[PDB]
């Protein structure tokens, strides 16, 4: 018995076709993805293959002005139109709180929405009851396939789920559900979830009964053979894990932003055991035409978005690199741009002995969501910017001791290599890491720009000295695991809205050209 697993993850409001880098589509002929093109491929597969399942591993929410305006109603509608069979909850599904998930996605979906490691409490228990499920047994031909969801244990620090949602460890929560499914005579079980390639590998290895793991979060690209685009594979497709009970469990992820469609053909024996697994993500390029009906629908919905696509903020003569492969790994010129705008906003004239009250900036790479292309006469529009900073947050002023900030830079890279959001971008700071060192001891050099000086220059960070830092409210609140900031900060003053601060600076500058200049160095 052969099942075809079609899967997406981390679509992040990429409803329309995009450029190769996921930014706004300019030259349509070189454009990729979008729900209208995905529909065409999905329909073609359904016609050729007898047993098909279309799955989403979370993070459909947040990414472009589609989400800013439609707040999840476009997700429900277009996922229903593509006829998804199931969806696991990602972290960004809580960006607008529980209420923003329940309405509209949970109530409007025509497919089950899953987690299992999310437990509601207090008044929420009855309010969310039956709207999300730990698993769902789905009929596929003459057979049944159990799908069991999971969401990152880290979601309370990455999004806004609130206090009445408890995020249990994934492996601990999954084992009883899979065990229960086997007692209800379900022998083919898919683990669909949003926790990251490392966790997916652990689920495959530790949760007895899981036939195949379909993941997300880490934007992991896996491929068998020579890849078709700019993405570099982290491993083969599928990634084979050997379970503690001695079974070969395939692990799959389909990169992000609907560029690729995950495709995995599994051959199962009568007892529900995986005999073989093969496949590859399908590059959704201009060769695959967009569905005319879905395109007409996307266009109907695109009208309410157009009043933000106009007015030029300024120009850039350089490519603004807001790609996660860059910003979550090393110094990125978009990072330097946003930090330069952050410092520029806080220029306050007082005291002869201070050139300015604040010289330092820190920004997590997980906060930078998109690059901006310079090739359409270098124009930067509000829309272009709204894909980079979509969260509607503020850039705040904090008082931090040198030790707190040193701990912050250690956290920044404590698990470097997993494409996690905590990697810090900087302004008025020159940091040097030795990643070959043990976590908690990777910062080898940390120099900061002076404030109590007439000529600003870099001096080494002092542990007992209190420094003023411009930083997003998300980090000030202990987001991305920056608990030491929330706990040890000496003062916290809220500032201006994130997108406004960067638009104002782009407008003041008229023509920008940020470089990667050595603010962050490794070895």
């Amino acid at each position, epitope marked *: 018995w052969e099942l075809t697993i079609l899967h997406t993850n981390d679509v992040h409001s990429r409803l329309e076709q995009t450029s190769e880098d996921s930014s706004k589509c300019v030259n349509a002929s070189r454009c990729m993805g979008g729900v209208a093109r995905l529909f065409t491929k999905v329909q073609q597969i359904r016609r050729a293959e007898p047993n098909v399942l279309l799955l989403d591993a979370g993070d459909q929410y947040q990414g472009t002005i589609w989400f800013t305006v439609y707040k999840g*109603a476009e997700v*429900a*509608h277009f996922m*229903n139109a593509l006829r998804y069979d199931a969806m696991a909850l990602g972290n960004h599904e809580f960006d607008n709180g529980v209420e923003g998930l329940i309405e*509209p996605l*949970l*109530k*409007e*979906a*025509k*497919f*089950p929405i899953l987690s299992a490691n999310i437990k509601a409490k207090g008044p929420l228990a*009855s309010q969310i*009851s*039956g*709207l999300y*499920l730990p698993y769902k*047994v789905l*009929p596929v031909g003459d057979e*049944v396939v159990g799908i069991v969801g999971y969401t990152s244990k880290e979601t309370p620090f990455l999004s806004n789920p609130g206090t009445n949602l408890v995020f249990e460890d994934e492996i601990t929560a999954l084992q009883p559900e899979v065990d229960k499914l086997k007692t*209800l005579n379900v022998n083919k079980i898919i683990a669909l979830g949003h926790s990251g390639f490392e966790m997916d590998k652990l689920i495959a290895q530790k949760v007895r009964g899981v036939d195949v793991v379909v993941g997300g979060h880490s934007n992991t690209f896996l491929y068998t053979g020579n890849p078709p685009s700019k993405e570099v594979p982290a491993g083969k497709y599928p990634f084979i894990v050997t379970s503690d009970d001695g079974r070969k469990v395939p692990v799959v992820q389909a990169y992000a932003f609907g560029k690729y469609l995950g495709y995995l053909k599994i051959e199962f024996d009568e007892r529900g055991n995986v005999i073989s697994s093969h496949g590859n993500p399908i590059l959704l390029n201009s060769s695959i035409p967009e569905d005319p009906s879905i395109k007409a629908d996307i266009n109907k919905w695109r009208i309410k978005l157009d009043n933000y696509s106009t007015q030029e903020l300024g120009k850039t003569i350089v490519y603004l690199d807001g790609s996660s492969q860059s910003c979550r790994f090393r110094e990125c010129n978009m990072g330097n741009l946003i930090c330069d705008a952050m410092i520029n906003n806080n220029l306050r004239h007082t005291d002869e002995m201070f050139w300015n009250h604040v010289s330092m900036c820190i920004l997590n790479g997980g906060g930078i969501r998109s690059p901006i292309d310079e090739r359409n006469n270098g124009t930067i529009t509000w829309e272009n910017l709204a894909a980079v900073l979509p969260f509607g947050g503020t850039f705040d002023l904090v008082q931090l001791k040198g030790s707190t900030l040193k701990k912050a830079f250690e956290h920044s890279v404590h698990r470097y290599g997993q494409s996690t959001g905590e990697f810090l971008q900087v302004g008025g700071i020159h940091v040097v890491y030795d990643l070959s060192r043990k976590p908690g001891d990777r910062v080898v050099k940390l120099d900061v720009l002076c404030t109590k000086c007439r000529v600003p220059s870099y001096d080494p960070l002092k542990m007992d000295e209190v420094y003023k830092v411009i930083l997003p409210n998300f980090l000030a609140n202990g987001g991305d695991g920056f608990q030491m900031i929330k706990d040890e900060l000496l003062r916290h003053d809220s500032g201006d809205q994130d997108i406004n601060v960067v638009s104002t600076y782009i407008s003041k500058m008229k023509v920008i050209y940020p470089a990667v200049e050595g603010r962050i160095k490794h070895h």
Partner: antibody
Amino acid sequence: QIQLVQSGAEVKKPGASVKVSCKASGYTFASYNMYWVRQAPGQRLEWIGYIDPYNGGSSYNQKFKGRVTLTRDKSASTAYMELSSLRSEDTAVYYCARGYNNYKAWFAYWGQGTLVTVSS
Amino acid sequence: IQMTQSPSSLSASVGDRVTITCKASQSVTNDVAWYQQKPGKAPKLLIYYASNRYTGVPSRFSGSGYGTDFTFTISSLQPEDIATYYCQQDYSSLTFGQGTKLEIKR
């Protein structure tokens, strides 16, 4: 508060057609499928069909293939059920219903019912 | 898919535990719902996903089962429970049970 209000009782001759209305208030009408079910005296609740009020696409129970037509007026937040070639067997209480969610047919919301009497 | 309800009719005193069954002609997973219907009224949703209780339905009402054999219970029969109860499946298309009329002994 999510209310479904149906057109009143009808009496139709065998051979005639009937069009029952269902006005939805309390939620975005176009965003959820609307179900039509009926209850004939001592016969058990029978599904008629459902419609997606966004595009007017519907799925029907095979028993009424070419007899029932499901439509809607988006601007009026109203769903229509038209049953033609009326037989005495269509003497039933006609209901429009909506799910707790758009996934399953767990009818949390029902219309008051519309009695259609097929007699000469 | 046919949904067959046995007991079909039953009488019980106030405070009693009442159990009614619904049998599906084939496996319906947990895709079963239960409704309460009073004479001149529309049915009220009580239980969905075979065991999940709908919003204001009292804790004395419960459901159980997985594929084929289904159960509905009133753990403390009250005079307001005087109705016909229907089971339903939404696995293949949509079918209902023929009902169970509940009457109370007084």
